[PDB]
User: Which sequence fits this backbone?
């Protein structure tokens, strides 16, 4: 239920502390048993390169999964944000 | 049960990221309903002043309670550690 809300706040806060993240644009997190599977979209600088945006996504995946132990799948993508 | 273990790891990691903490010496955390009440003892530099040790304890209380939302009481004390 709304113990999902507290986990979601953790996910957003963890993603936002990674260098290059300009906000979490979208987060869809689901329980698969006691595990969380999630998809997220982060904002990035429009003038970052596609490669850099991919690096930031992987840094976000690593930070979030590193801080939130119950997460077992996280897909991070990126969109331009000012 | 052992969802307490994951919360306890969060508490120790949060305390250890505060300036002046040389390890968590002791942590006793209990559920009061869905809330956690905790007592912890941190290690500090023997040559810190009593006042500085009190500051570090309050910084730990603030960091931990700030990161772990279900915590509703936390008492932090300090002991000398090399």
Assistant:
């Amino acid at each position: 239920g709304s113990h999902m809300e507290a986990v979601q706040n953790r996910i957003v806060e963890a993603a936002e502390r990674v260098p290059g993240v300009r906000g979490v644009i979208h987060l869809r997190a689901r329980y698969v048993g006691q595990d969380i599977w999630a998809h997220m979209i982060i904002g990035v600088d429009p003038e970052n390169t596609v490669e850099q945006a991919h690096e930031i996504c992987e840094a976000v995946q690593a930070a979030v999964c590193g801080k939130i132990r119950r997460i077992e799948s996280l897909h991070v993508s990126a969109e331009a944000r000012e």
About this structure: Helices of chain A lie at 3-16, 50-67.
